[PDB]
């Protein structure tokens, strides 16, 4: 049964690009990919982080390829993509792990600032997808996986309209699946729930009487799983989405939330 | 055909409580109600606003009943409710127009602050509903209308978990409809789109070359209606929800958005 | 307050085409329209029905214009449309009330039969919409209302794929709203619940012991409204959708179901 | 990387009950489970089928345990369950593969017939779930997987109300996930698309000119994947749902549809 499990879930002989994965969530997702036989490629805006990245991967026994590129840089990404496509080879899997916009109150930011985020920052994951599609098509099999922002992510300002950008993960997932599914590309999403991170570690701090932090207690009650998400919880689900096992799954958002959205359906 | 239009859409001889409606959106919704024959009752946390309220209604030729109550005040609301029920009579229609929480970054606020918002602030619309149900049931017909925050509302911090409170409009709408529909109560919601307010008037400011503000231009492109919402757009829809015309409609969210959510469905 | 109620909800000086409305549901919807000041136009495949139609309308004190056309007839509908546009004038409101396909088991029907239903029968409401859009646009205001099949409709065979036709109400609603909302056309739907009809009157028959029919009892328990829908329940909601009151509502499915879909959300 | 792939996706030392899986879909799902190290248990209403079952499994090199039970038989299932729990041991995984009701037109069937389907036939998957929960809880880990009827399944009569039964997969999935997620049970669903079966093989028959059957051609156009589903496509997805890899996934419907639902979202 080793061969069966390998046939369906293995990522052997496949190049996987996971944007931003020099730490945190993208990182532990790439970690899981590597451990399933994938070749890891990732990026970040500045060199120091990339290095910290590779070091961190190495300590786990992973040879990662790390580049310096802004995901929002149009020409930059394309260069990074075909540069990967020689140094490392054809990208089989793209994990869009994009977000965390410069948090400037929508009334403080100038027209210049809007023009930027609307035209560039929000189109990032589309740019990166567009950059890697021609290859995947050539080779006859692609996996593009879009990771929605986790429900843990604090400080996000709700902007309903931004869901209508051509970038923007729920939209993008569905259009790429529709337009490019027939060239054997599967585009899907991960919807992470309340994933514990050091950022939200205060919201778990035990009280002076040793009772649970109020918010921590809310999350536990309202999550049927009765516990926070851990980054590791997204690992396997993401392989599944990157492996032959999900080849007839397209345009679907997989929610890794301990069933909280389902509790919101009673 | 005057009698027909009156039979289905009139709000004559019906008491309507619209929380917070001393200005802005709740105000223009109450304005429309009055003009359809309703009796207006509203509240606010402090007296000066209530007065400004009544003045504003009067100038339009509307006698409004204005009380001073915090929507979040448990005992306060109940008092306000039966006090209305003698001075003005049985509340037929409740318009929950609740939101705009003290915008303190979720990492700055203490456990005390969370304990408050989780247990009190988020349960407000449930408290106010609970306070007015026994009457509506007695009389044999209720309308509770929950107004989701408009897509125009800036500074809202996304907190997926808060949708699971028993207050919280999408949840509350569905439970009240389910539990109390058989006592002839119809609970539904309005989902306002990008409604122009003086707050977001900067986002409409014409540029130095006389071209459209970038964000303003986004909203127009992505809204099939090709224009922002105006408060007046919610008036009639809300009567409809408060009138005999919607008596076999329950647990439904009516979106007044110029079809932007539908564009997000391509 | 007569003028207010008229301004928002009246259908005066507006031509309304309601396909099939020579009896039943479309009929009582047209009945309500007329009573709100609309001019009624309707059709059917054969003359005898049309006549029965007009007679039925007349007895209620309504002058209806009745034509003979197959909704599926491409060239036929266009003729019927501009023929209406002279004899009666510009169609302001289109109510697509389309469905009830020849119930032949999907394995009994030949390729000829499929070719027909896929290419013609399912595109009907799109054909009729397409036929009336140029006028509505000219005049600067349209209402196209698509009436989903009621949950009462027995014998419907589930064919998930048919939702992907360009006809087909949920799809059509969203595309027309998106493409033509900016020419001030509002396209929306009614989703009728369990509407009592003489067809399903057996499912309400009291038992020999005077207890409720099992199915009748199911519907009452699972509908929060605790009763079946009546055709009349769709009347006002449909005006609302046809009146100035819903002008900033587009691409939305209004469910008139006594809150059963909401009970299915607990 | 064999140990990693085994840790997350293996079904070793786990008992899997897949109702009805003596042929067809449940069968190929069990086939895949076995090949991932699971122990297969299945049932059917009559002995001959069970035998045909075991034979079919054996030829593939699988020792299956086959019982005779009606899924709808209340007392019968419980017996079958604890009987399995000694002869085979604790059921770790339940795959509800329930449906295909006696297709009698809803107007032909008596109150007796309704009383049956409403109270018994529709509660089946709930009965079987209820029967296997106490064990899974004891052992500290359960997987209950509900397989929605495939979009391929012809002759299904649409009965919106039946979604409100406590059996009934979309409802059941969400309630079990909510109530029992905190005892470490993960309940989820598979939503199969247009899965090719010998039943619908006529709908794929090439025409006398060698062109594609009209319906076959529709499915290919409207499915972004551009091809029908095969039973094998549900195999891995179902393991994923049965394995440690999906432990923080609860109350979720996984659609294995080649992205057709997503095309219905444009």
TrEMBL record, chains A, B, C, D:
SUPFAM superfamilies xref list: NAD(P)-binding Rossmann-fold domains
Molecular functions (GO terms): oxidoreductase activity, acting on the CH-OH group of donors, NAD or NADP as acceptor
Keyword Oxidoreductase among UniProt keywords: yes
Alphabetical UniProt keywords: Oxidoreductase
Keyword flag rRNA processing: no
A biological-process GO annotation: bile acid metabolic process
Pfam families: adh_short_C2
Family: Belongs to the short-chain dehydrogenases/reductases (SDR) family.
NCBIfam families: PRK07097.1
Protein name: Gluconate 5-dehydrogenase
């Amino acid at each position: 049964t080793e061969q069966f499990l390998k046939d369906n879930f293995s990522l052997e002989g496949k190049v996987a690009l996971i944007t931003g994965a020099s730490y945190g969530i993208g990182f532990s997702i790439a970690t899981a990919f590597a451990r399933a036989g994938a070749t890891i490629v990732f990026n970040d805006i500045k060199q120091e982080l990339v290095d910290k990245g590779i070091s961190a991967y190495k300590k786990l026994g992973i040879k990662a390829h790390g580049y310096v590129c802004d995901v929002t840089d149009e020409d930059g990404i394309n260069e990074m993509v075909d540069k990967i496509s020689q140094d490392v080879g054809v990208i089989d899997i793209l994990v869009n792990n994009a977000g965390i916009i410069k948090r400037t109150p929508m009334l403080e930011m100038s027209a210049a600032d809007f023009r930027q985020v609307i035209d560039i920052d929000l189109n990032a994951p589309f740019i990166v997808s567009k950059a890697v599609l021609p290859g995947m098509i050539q080779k006859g099999h692609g996996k593009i996986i879009n990771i929605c922002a986790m429900m843990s992510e604090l400080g996000r300002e709700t902007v309903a309209a931004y869901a209508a950008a051509k970038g923007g993960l729920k939209m993008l997932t569905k259009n790429i699946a529709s337009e490019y599914g027939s060239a054997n590309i599967q585009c899907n999403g991960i919807g992470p729930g309340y994933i514990a991170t050091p950022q939200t570690a205060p919201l778990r701090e035990r009280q002076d009487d040793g009772s649970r932090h109020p918010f921590d207690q809310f999350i536990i009650a309202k999550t049927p799983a009765a516990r926070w998400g851990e980054a590791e919880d997204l690992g396997a689900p993401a392989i599944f989405l990157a492996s032959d096992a999900s080849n007839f799954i397209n345009g679907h958002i997989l929610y890794v939330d301990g069933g909280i959205l389902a509790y919101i359906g009673k």
